[PDB]
Amino acid sequence: PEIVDTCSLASPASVCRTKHLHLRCSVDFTRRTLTGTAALTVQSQEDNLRSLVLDTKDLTIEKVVINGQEVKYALGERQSYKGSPMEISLPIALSKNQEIVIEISFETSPKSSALQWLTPEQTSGKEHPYLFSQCQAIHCRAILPCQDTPSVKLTYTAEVSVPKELVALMSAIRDGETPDPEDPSRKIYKFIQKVPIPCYLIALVVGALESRQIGPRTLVWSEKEQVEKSAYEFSETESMLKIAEDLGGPYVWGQYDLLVLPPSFPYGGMENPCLTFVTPTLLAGDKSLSNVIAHEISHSWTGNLVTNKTWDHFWLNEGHTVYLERHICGRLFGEKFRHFNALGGWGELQNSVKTFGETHPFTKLVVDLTDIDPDVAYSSVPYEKGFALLFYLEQLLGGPEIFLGFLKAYVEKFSYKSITTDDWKDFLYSYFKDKVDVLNQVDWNAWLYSPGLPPIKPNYDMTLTNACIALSQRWITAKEDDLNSFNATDLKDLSSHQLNEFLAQTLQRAPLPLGHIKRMQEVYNFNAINNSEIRFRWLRLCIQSKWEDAIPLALKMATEQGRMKFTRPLFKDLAAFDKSHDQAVRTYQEHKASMHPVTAMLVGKDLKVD
Numbered sequence: 001p002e003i004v005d006t007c008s009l010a011s012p013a014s015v016c017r018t019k020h021l022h023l024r025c026s027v028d029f030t031r032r033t034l035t036g037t038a039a040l041t042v043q044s045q046e047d048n049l050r051s052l053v054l055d056t057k058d059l060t061i062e063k064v065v066i067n068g069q070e071v072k073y074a075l076g077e078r079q080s081y082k083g084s085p086m087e088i089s090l091p092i093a094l095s096k097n098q099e100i101v102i103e104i105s106f107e108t109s110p111k112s113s114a115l116q117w118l119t120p121e122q123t124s125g126k127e128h129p130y131l132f133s134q135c136q137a138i139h140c141r142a143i144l145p146c147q148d149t150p151s152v153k154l155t156y157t158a159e160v161s162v163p164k165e166l167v168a169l170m171s172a173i174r175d176g177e178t179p180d181p182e183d184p185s186r187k188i189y190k191f192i193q194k195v196p197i198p199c200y201l202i203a204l205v206v207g208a209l210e211s212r213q214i215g216p217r218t219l220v221w222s223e224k225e226q227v228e229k230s231a232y233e234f235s236e237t238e239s240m241l242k243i244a245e246d247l248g249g250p251y252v253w254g255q256y257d258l259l260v261l262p263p264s265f266p267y268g269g270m271e272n273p274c275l276t277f278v279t280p281t282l283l284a285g286d287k288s289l290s291n292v293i294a295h296e297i298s299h300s301w302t303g304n305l306v307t308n309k310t311w312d313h314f315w316l317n318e319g320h321t322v323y324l325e326r327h328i329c330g331r332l333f334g335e336k337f338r339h340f341n342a343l344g345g346w347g348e349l350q351n352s353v354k355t356f357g358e359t360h361p362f363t364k365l366v367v368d369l370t371d372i373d374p375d376v377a378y379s380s381v382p383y384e385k386g387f388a389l390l391f392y393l394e395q396l397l398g399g400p401e402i403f404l405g406f407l408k409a410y411v412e413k414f415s416y417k418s419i420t421t422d423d424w425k426d427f428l429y430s431y432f433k434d435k436v437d438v439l440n441q442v443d444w445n446a447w448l449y450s451p452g453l454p455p456i457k458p459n460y461d462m463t464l465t466n467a468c469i470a471l472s473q474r475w476i477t478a479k480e481d482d483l484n485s486f487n488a489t490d491l492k493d494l495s496s497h498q499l500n501e502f503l504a505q506t507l508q509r510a511p512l513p514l515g516h517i518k519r520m521q522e523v524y525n526f527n528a529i530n531n532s533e534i535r536f537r538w539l540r541l542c543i544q545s546k547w548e549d550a551i552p553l554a555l556k557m558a559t560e561q562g563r564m565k566f567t568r569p570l571f572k573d574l575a576a577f578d579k580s581h582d583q584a585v586r587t588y589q590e591h592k593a594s595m596h597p598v599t600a601m602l603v604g605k606d607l608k609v610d
């Protein structure tokens, strides 16, 4: 038995394992480069090892040093999105289990697909620049040479130099600050990560950062003007950490800090160990998007502790994480709320399947990513098909109490390791050996490997959903003589989550007649709502229903923030509406140079330009 990562060009885990990284680097805002040395401790897994291969993407290599001597190296030609393979020739041949430190002096490209450089005018303070990393899935190679695969896990110590008036933070514990020994006006921040992580969890941020304390092991980081709203928005963090510890075992990372990025941050969150990255679009002003925090918190076990071996098995990361997320929200707000969110996720699943097509290879639970850019295939499917499976099994195996017992053991058995769907399923059968017959009733083939909607829908409690269906249906079937009965009172007992679910449900039946959508704004005033989730679905409904007045609103939102879940479909909807098409394409061309590289490439492909 042997399994290879088809997203990596580096030497595989069965040949050699990276065990440690010493990073010393300089952050240069003038050149937009990351400069420095990456010292890799490498353990050989076979006898007679003469050379290894590492991943790179648009990297400049200065020199390769092994034991104080320069050695031979060769970069192969670029294989599109995978980058360029780097063969390093070792001077002394390695036996099984032997270690060598390989020091690579590197410079990053200004166009690194891992990083976004912000000018002062692109930030909030407007006086200092900004940089952030997003390595997931395979962008770490665009920062440093590494085995860019989640099948390898490594500790790391880092030392990064930044201008005196800026703060560096990494996916590690802060080791304190001391001025550069060979310095301009600079500060050299030190970091240590004692826990072995996959390299996609390596992260760096540099900007005019200030912090506020909101929990015993939690600090919110952001620019001065965001720190206030953030401290309030995420107050529930420690209480979420506590419930997550009860569900998955002890939290091993020591510290759980949050960082609120610039609006161009491409995701809801990123579970960078010790330092969760979140979008500023979470700042609703009422804590209502805090499920995203629960999500990143849950990754401290499912994802960061037990890690997908290859990206083919991404669903292990996200399925279990969404499962724990919804349990945190459930234990906080009630079991009925947990069902409401679970049904809404099925809803999102339905949408991804309709969008891709019910026979699309990207709707499979386990996808073959041979010659597929992980960024193109990314969707809600692994999240929600993954949640549905676990949810279904939970109901099948006798409830959440029993299944959370499996979950805890699963985290315990596979902690600090990298696993496949098969390891998971094999452990499932091992744990529930008293229930093998029940497990053989499940259509494993269809769930794991079939496209489309799952072969079976779980059971959902409907308490909080009914009012959403009632109202959505009323609008969807509305005629002229219903329009005057619609009223602000329709919304009186609805939470922001229910409002969102109402719009999601109505969006599935778009377009609605223009007159009806105009009447919707007349009676509900959905334009005045700043909740990003609500605004997003609302503006999509408007654009898809041919409302011209919504064009500048959707244009504003699509470019005033970068979160791909909002930005991409807004651009797509605006391209599909003939009134806005030209303007959508023009707006993207003006904004693309100052957008995030991954977001730019994706929106560009969405729009069929370049």
Ligand SMILES: N[C@@H](CCC(=O)Nc1ccc(OC[C@@H](O)c2ccccc2)cc1)C(=O)O
Pocket: 136, 137, 267, 268, 269, 270, 271, 295, 296, 311, 312, 313, 314, 315, 318, 362, 364, 365, 366, 367, 373, 374, 375, 376, 377, 378, 379, 381, 382
């Ligand atoms: N982890 C964060 C979001 C950023 C992220 O997951 N990045 C990312 C990007 C591309 C990926 O690609 C693999 C993906 O294309 C895929 C799709 C379907 C099935 C398996 C894998 C995986 C993760 C979070 O959950 O809050």
Ligand SMILES: [Yb+3]
Pocket: 062, 107
């Ligand atoms: Yb150089």
Ligand SMILES: [Yb+3]
Pocket: 031, 033, 107
């Ligand atoms: Yb340079």
Ligand SMILES: [Yb+3]
Pocket: 479, 481, 482
């Ligand atoms: Yb009627």
Ligand SMILES: [Zn+2]
Pocket: 295, 299, 317, 318, 321
């Ligand atoms: Zn996740």
